[PDB]
Design an enzyme around this catalytic site. Structure first.
Site, PDB file in Angstrom:
ATOM      1  N   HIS A  28       0.695  -1.187  -0.059  1.00  0.00           N
ATOM      2  CA  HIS A  28      -0.068   0.262  -0.043  1.00  0.00           C
ATOM      3  C   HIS A  28       0.792   1.288  -0.029  1.00  0.00           C
ATOM      4  O   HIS A  28       0.140   2.245   0.121  1.00  0.00           O
ATOM      5  CB  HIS A  28      -0.784   0.238   1.353  1.00  0.00           C
ATOM      6  CG  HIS A  28      -1.444  -1.370   1.639  1.00  0.00           C
ATOM      7  ND1 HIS A  28      -1.842  -2.396   0.718  1.00  0.00           N
ATOM      8  CD2 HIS A  28      -1.416  -2.133   2.784  1.00  0.00           C
ATOM      9  CE1 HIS A  28      -2.290  -3.306   1.459  1.00  0.00           C
ATOM     10  NE2 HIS A  28      -1.802  -3.378   2.404  1.00  0.00           N
ATOM     11  N   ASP A  50       0.981 -11.681   0.465  1.00  0.00           N
ATOM     12  CA  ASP A  50       2.418 -10.725   0.548  1.00  0.00           C
ATOM     13  C   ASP A  50       3.482 -11.555   0.557  1.00  0.00           C
ATOM     14  O   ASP A  50       4.501 -11.594   1.516  1.00  0.00           O
ATOM     15  CB  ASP A  50       2.279  -9.937   1.899  1.00  0.00           C
ATOM     16  CG  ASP A  50       3.278  -8.859   1.872  1.00  0.00           C
ATOM     17  OD1 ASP A  50       3.677  -8.474   0.651  1.00  0.00           O
ATOM     18  OD2 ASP A  50       3.461  -8.300   2.813  1.00  0.00           O
ATOM     19  N   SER A 102       1.977   1.213   8.607  1.00  0.00           N
ATOM     20  CA  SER A 102       1.783  -0.233   8.015  1.00  0.00           C
ATOM     21  C   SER A 102       3.185  -0.808   8.246  1.00  0.00           C
ATOM     22  O   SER A 102       4.061  -0.259   7.748  1.00  0.00           O
ATOM     23  CB  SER A 102       1.252  -0.217   6.480  1.00  0.00           C
ATOM     24  OG  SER A 102       1.521  -1.416   5.719  1.00  0.00           O
TER      25      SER A 102
END
Lengths: 151, 49
Positions: A28, A50, A102
């Site tokens: 992101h 991921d 994040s």
């Protein structure tokens, strides 16, 4: 611990962590890692599971270890505080829930990483986190609560 | 000529069996991929719960 952040025009917007045998980076955010040894690695894109590539050699590998099985709902440590939840993620108060957090790892009492956050800015009085984890037999899944903005 | 030509007058047995092999082969490769594409979506939906 070792968790190098991600730079983009000076401001901090992402975090990259190192596990035993591999490196991680969320999708992101866009930017370049300031570490030169962590910038020449071929980071390959993937799905929500991921997958990244830990092509760095052994001599700095395994700063931390990923969590084993037998996960209780007990105490888990966090950079801004603590969390006590296994099925979902704990209703942490405000302050945490900003922007650019994040990729910060969630660790147990024994310094072993359990989950990596990717979203869940603010869900009212109770704030949830969209993380990845291993469900029952080590298969890496992605958990997202309802209305989880990319954080 | 006494008779009348048609479209399928010239197709022999082996010519008709050759094109139906090539029709069925490429349609089998597609449904082999289409079976495996929706199988892994089920196991990805079953690892989460």
């Amino acid at each position: 611990d070792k968790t190098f952040p991600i730079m983009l025009n000076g401001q901090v917007n992402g975090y990259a962590c190192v596990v035993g045998g591999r490196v991680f980076k969320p999708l992101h955010v866009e930017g370049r890692i300031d570490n030169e040894q962590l910038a020449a690695i071929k980071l390959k894109k993937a799905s929500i599971y991921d997958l990244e590539y830990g092509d760095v050699p052994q001599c700095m590998k395994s700063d931390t270890l990923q969590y084993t099985s037998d996960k209780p709902p007990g105490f888990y440590n966090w950079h801004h505080g603590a969390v006590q939840y296994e099925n979902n993620r704990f209703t942490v108060p405000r302050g945490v829930g900003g922007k650019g957090d994040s990729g910060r790892p969630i660790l147990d009492n024994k310094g072993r990483v359990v989950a990596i956050v990717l979203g869940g800015v603010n869900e009212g009085s109770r704030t949830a986190l969209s993380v990845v984890t291993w469900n029952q037999k080590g298969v890496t899944v992605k958990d997202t609560p309802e209305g989880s903005e990319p954080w | 000529a006494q008779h009348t030509e048609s479209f399928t007058s010239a197709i022999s047995a082996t010519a008709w069996s050759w094109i139906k092999v090539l029709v069925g082969g490429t349609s089998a490769f597609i449904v082999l991929g289409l079976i495996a594409t929706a199988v892994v979506a089920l196991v990805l939906f079953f690892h989460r719960h």
